[PDB]
Amino acid sequence: LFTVTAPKEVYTVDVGSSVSLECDFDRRECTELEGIRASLQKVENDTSLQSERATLLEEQLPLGKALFHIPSVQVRDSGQYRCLVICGAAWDYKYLTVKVKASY
Amino acid sequence: SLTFYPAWLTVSEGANATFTCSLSNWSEDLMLNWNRLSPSNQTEKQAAFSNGLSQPVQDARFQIIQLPNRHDFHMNILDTRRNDSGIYLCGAISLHPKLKIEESPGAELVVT
């Protein structure tokens, strides 16, 4: 019954600038008893691994947001990601899309 | 990798619907979710399998039942409703030695 939602699902960014991506989760299904972990994974095929480019702004977690930051966006950062939250045994994810504007 | 079959399933309303989620080269620690795609193509969680227990997000018609001596799982919708029609998939997560998500291809359910 733990679930993740993505009220913001599409994000826009200019090459050279940073992008933030986020998904929200149901906190009354997460305590510090079983731990909380969040990850962003770029979709490159059927299996995803942790993004090398993104980091987690973990100060947002107690507010029920998994907020990710990718600095210095390049064209190859375009496309779909899975925003994943794990609370003890329970997990869920949402797809997020990054749209990039490249200039010169 | 994960597969999910049959690719297309059509049943009469009230009948059960069964998909099979099949996991290849996976470890003993199985954490498997059953998701449905929204009209916007976003994933929505239907049920979760972990330990050796299936739990539904909210509808107990959705059950994940491990098959005999296999890393194969029936994803059963008991007593289908027409508005169950749509695309479904399964996804699995491993936490060790590295975090990874694997998704199956979609499979389409039509309830008439």
Domain parsing of chain B, residue ranges: 1-112
Backbone angles phi, psi at A77, to 5 degrees: -80, -10
Which residues are CB-contacts of B14 (< 8 A; sequence separation ≥ 6)? B79, B80
A76 exposed, middle or buried (CB, 10 Å; 0-12, 13-18, 19+)? exposed
Specified resolution (Å):
1.7
Contact at CB, A47 and B101, closer than 8 angstroms: yes
Interface mutation target, options B51, B64, B101, chain A, most CBs of A under 10 Å: B101
Cis peptide upstream of residue B6 (ω within 30 degrees of 0): yes
Judging contacts by C-beta atoms under 8 Å, the chain B residues touching residue A50 are 98-99
Contact at CB, B43 and A94, closer than 8 angstroms: yes
B23 closest CA partner among B80, B67, B53: B67
For A:5-44, CB contacts with B below 8 A are 6, 9, 37, 39, 41
Q: Quick check: B46 and B59 in contact, CB under 8 A?
A: yes
Q: Is A49 touching B (CB cutoff 8 A)?
A: yes
Distance in Å, alpha carbon of B90 to nearest chain A alpha carbon: 11
Q: How far apart are CA B74 and CA A12, in angstroms?
A: 40
N-to-C CA span, chain A: 47
B68 C-beta neighbours (distance < 10 Å), count: 5
Determined by X-ray
A72 exposed, middle or buried (CB, 10 Å; 0-12, 13-18, 19+)? exposed
Q: Between vectors from CA B35 to CA B31 and to CA B40, what angle results, nearest 5°?
A: 145
Q: How far apart are CA A17 and CA A31, in angstroms?
A: 35
Contact at CB, B101 and A84, closer than 8 angstroms: yes
Which domains occur in chain A, in start order? 1-104 (2.60.40.10)
Contact at CB, B2 and A46, closer than 8 angstroms: yes
Nearest to B1 among A41, A47, A49 (CB): A47
CATH topology for B1-112?
A: Immunoglobulin-like (2.60.40)
Strand-pair category, B107-111 with B8-11: parallel
Tokens representing residue B103 in the block: 């998704």
List residues bridging with A98 in a β-sheet. Answer: A11, A79
What Å distances lie between residue A21 and A60, B10, B55, B86, B106, CA to CA? 12, 38, 29, 28, 25
Q: Quick check: A83 and A94 in contact, CB under 8 A?
A: yes
Which residues are CB-contacts of B28 (< 8 A; sequence separation ≥ 6)? none
